[PDB]
Amino acid sequence: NTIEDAVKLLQECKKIIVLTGAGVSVSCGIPDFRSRDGIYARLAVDFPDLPDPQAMFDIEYFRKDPRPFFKFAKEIYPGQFQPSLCHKFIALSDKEGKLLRNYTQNIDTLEQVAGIQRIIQCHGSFATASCLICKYKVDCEAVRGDIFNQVVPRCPRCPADEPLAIMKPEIVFFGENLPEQFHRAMKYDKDEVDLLIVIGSSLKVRPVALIPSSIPHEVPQILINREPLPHLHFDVELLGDCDVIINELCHRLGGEYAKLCCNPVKLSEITE
Ligand SMILES: NC(=O)c1ccc[n+]([C@@H]2O[C@H](COP(=O)([O-])OP(=O)(O)OC[C@H]3O[C@@H](n4cnc5c(N)ncnc54)[C@H](O)[C@@H]3O)[C@@H](O)[C@H]2O)c1
Ligand SMILES: NC(=O)[C@H]1CCCCc2c1[nH]c1ccc(Cl)cc21
Ligand SMILES: [Zn+2]
């Protein structure tokens, strides 16, 4: 349960699964969900008319009133931020052939900018949109204009008389099923994985939260996070800023990893 043990594991293991959440994008300028400076805290101020902050990405509320989501969607739309050190570390692991899979809970699509190939977007993305009623699929470009104008995009197939004929981006809301590729990948990966690393996630959301216990118990597990996850037992817990920790791991690993080293907590201001 030391940083030296994490390095030893990183040097020895060849089929690594990295599970990431909103914590890895905090340094990029994207807030997480549940921290004091998270999405929920910001939603409580900026969208006080919601029953609760969780309603913004809840399928039941979206069906009732989709206007708040399309007021907010442009704020979380991909293509405006740069990848963190963590993204680059995962990308290098992939190039080095050591990465089995990066399961990401983020929709920011920074993995694509960083160059991570072996990637699963567990909670979907803005790349496609789907009608609530008829399940008609479009690519993002068909609905991009409506999103940036804060307008509710309507289904071309369904009649104008149907109120729920709304083109919803295929990001996974509460109450929705995850993309099939997630279940497909886990079915194969669980028998191949030789190391599991969780970075920047509270693991409070099913079924992704079930991954750490769905793989063989004998597989070593590392946590890189600001806080411990009380419900889960890890073999190594590296507690603190994930970029600081990864930067320290990169120094100790050397070679190509040491080339990623930088100053992740130098004095800086993030602008709006
Ligand atoms: N209606 C809703 O509210 C709703 C709907 C759909 C999905 N969700 C989901 O909630 C899911 C789970 O959230 P999550 O785990 O990704 O985020 P989270 O906010 O729950 O947890 C982020 C974790 O990372 C840590 N962290 C933050 N910054 C860090 C840093 N710089 N270094 C190290 N650690 C850091 C935090 O302490 C926290 O433990 C999201 O993927 C989202 O899909 C919520
Ligand atoms: N960095 C991400 O992309 C995170 C954190 C920023 C808010 C949007 C968001 C994220 N993850 C999600 C998963 C599902 C939904 Cl509906 C929305 C989100
Ligand atoms: Zn339709």
UniProtKB/Swiss-Prot annotation:
Binding, NAD(+): 21-40, 105-108, 200-202, 225-227, 242
UniProt: Zn(2+) binding residues: C131, C134, C155, C158
Nuclear export signal (motif): residue ranges: 185-191
Compartment list: Cytoplasm; Mitochondrion
Residues in Deacetylase sirtuin-type domain copies: 1-256
S-nitrosocysteine: modified positions: C155, C158
Effect in UniProt of substituting H123Y: Loss of function; abolishes both protein deacetylase, delactylase and decrotonylase activities. Reduces the interaction with CCAR2 and APEX1. Increases acetylation of APEX1
Active site: residue positions: H123
Sequence segments annotated as region (Interaction with CCAR2): 1-272
Region (Required for interaction with the sumoylated form of CCAR2): 16-19
Sites of N6-acetyllysine modification: K137, K190
Known role: Catalytically inactive 75SirT1 may be involved in regulation of apoptosis. May be involved in protecting chondrocytes from apoptotic death by associating with cytochrome C and interfering with apoptosome assembly.
Protein name, UniProt field: SirtT1 75 kDa fragment
Organism: Homo sapiens (Human)
Whole-protein coverage range: 241 to 512 of 747
